[PDB]
Every structure is written in structure tokens, then in C-alpha cells.
Specification:
There is one protein chain. The protein has about 325 residues and is an alpha+beta fold. Helices cover about 35% and strands about 15% of the residues. The strands form three sheets. It has a five-stranded antiparallel beta sheet, with no helix packed on it. Strands 6-8-9 form a three-stranded antiparallel beta sheet. It is globular. It starts with 10 loop residues before the first strand and ends in a 6-residue tail after the last helix. The structure holds ~{N}-(1~{H}-indazol-5-ylmethyl)ethanesulfonamide. ~{N}-(1~{H}-indazol-5-ylmethyl)ethanesulfonamide binds near residues 22 and 91. It comes from Homo sapiens (Human).
Length: about 325
Amino acid sequence: RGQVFDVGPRYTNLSYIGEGMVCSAYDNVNKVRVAIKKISPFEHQTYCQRTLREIKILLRFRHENIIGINDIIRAPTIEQMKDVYIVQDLMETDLYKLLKTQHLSNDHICYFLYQILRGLKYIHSANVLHRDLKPSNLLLNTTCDLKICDFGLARVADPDHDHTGFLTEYVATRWYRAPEIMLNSKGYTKSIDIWSVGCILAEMLSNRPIFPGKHYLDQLNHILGILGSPSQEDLNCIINLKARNYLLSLPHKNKVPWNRLFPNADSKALDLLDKMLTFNPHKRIEVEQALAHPYLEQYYDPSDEPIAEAPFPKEKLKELIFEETARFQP
Ligand SMILES: *CCS(=O)(=O)NCc1ccc2[nH]ncc2c1
């Protein structure tokens, strides 16, 4: 152990996983090990907001490629409730850990990408944006089943309020941020997630992040270094003068061909990558088009790619977390 990890007698024999804190544990009712994360969010409003949003989303979603919540453990009263524990299916590894050690065959890349997009189709069908897709948020088991996790930054899509100024600060993981985040976008459209998936695909191809920016504007430097300078048409879509004039200030950069960056990659994988890593978010491929792409033809089956049945102050938010978790109480 490290601290109080107080999960009733249902869950026993705890092993540390990572870091609030995550442990595996034996579930004495279902007779399997499970993952459990301790969330002590109530002293920080940021952790509380992300806790409630995640719980609400994950309890509504039901999909093979999205991690569920199996159980939530907390004290019987608001006064006694200092922590919440979320119990989820235990997955042996994640794509971040796997890519640090293992070469993926083209077949593995294809199947992982299929499952990411299949999960994402469901999320987007519920009018939700994940907004922090990255290898460590893709859980894997030993048979290569994949589950999307961490909905702490997820939002309902809101394309009419997507516009913002140049260099607006952003929360989600830097290396997977679409170029428009740095230029004119709050990340309130589905195209933000597709860019992250493109980055993940590129990372699966070479085991290295494609755009490892070291700070905020360096991320755009990395993206433009491979895509090259945006076209006049793509620039004309950027009405914000600060962002536009920044881009016009840069020396001309040529496109680096994908087949030079990824000489061992399948050509169909690179055609799909090109379409996910499109600079102009309006021209970027959508999740259903991505699934229908020739690269995924061995798996594509829209009848087996389900969609969601419908669209989706700390003191009141501790109350809302209490209410939302009530169904798991004895
Ligand atoms: C979803 C990525 S984190 O939440 O950062 N990692 C913690 C978890 C959560 C659920 C798991 N199931 N198996 C392993 C897990 C790790």
C-alpha cells in the first residue's frame, strides 16, 4: 500500500498500479481482479468538475471499446465522504507502455486503430468529445482488446462556440493537440479527436510521437514542419488576424511525404493518416469515414459499430457526485 485505500471487504489484496492512486484488487463477488482508482477531489474544484463529468459519461456509455464503471465506493453520507473509489475492468497494459517496448505488426496497428475508431464513433454519436486521446488513455489486455479511458476532459460538442483568439491556453496533452488549438479553436468540435487519433496512428507506425513539442507554440512548429505551410484556402479560413499574420510570417515549409517518414508503413495506412492529419479541421476526415477507409476493410461493419441510444460551486458538486454514485450503495 501507500495510503488509506479503503474499498470494503468486497475488494481485497491490493497491488499498486500508478498515480489520486490506482490499484488492482480481487473482487470477491465476480471472482476476478479489477482496477480501482481513489479520487480525493473535494478540496480542488478542478478535480471535482472532472470527476462528475467522467462519472456521468461513463455510467451512460455502454460500449466494448470504452472502459465502464463496474462499482463506485464511498461513505454512506456526504459528511463522511472524503474519497470516491471507481472500480473498472482490469486491463493488463496501455498503448503508451506497449509502444515503449514492442514493435507492432501492421495487423496489430490496423486492429488497434479499428477499435479506437469504433469506440470513438460511439462517443461522437452521443455528441461527446473525449479531448485527451493519447496512448496512455488506450487500455489493452493480452488478447489486444482495446478500451478508451479517461473522460476527465470530455465535453458535449459545441461547434458554434469553438472560436477563440490566437495562443489561447489549453488543458489537453500537448503532443496530441490539433494545430487549430494554437490558432483559433477551443477544441469543441469532433475534428479535435480525429487529429489525436491521427497522432496515435503515426506513433503506432514508428513507436515515437510524431509531433513532440516541448512547449505551447513549439507544438505548431512540429506540425508545420511535417505538413508544410498551409495553403491560401486553409489560411483564408483563419479569420483571426493574429493567428493569420503569425502563419504568414513563417518561411515557406514543404510537406514531408508520409512514405519518407514511415518507409515500412502500409500505403493504405498512410492514406488514412494523411486524411486524419489534415490541417484544416473542416476538411479532416470524420470518424465514420475513417472506419469506411480501405485500410480498415477487413474489420469495417457498420451494423457492428454501434451508436449511443441518445445525445448526451464545489458544495453543490460534492452533492452531485454523492447523488450520481448512490445507485452503487447496498
Ligand atoms: C485511463 C487511463 S488512467 O485512468 O490514467 N489509468 C488508470 C487506470 C484506470 C482503469 C484501468 N483498468 N485497468 C488498468 C487501469 C488503469
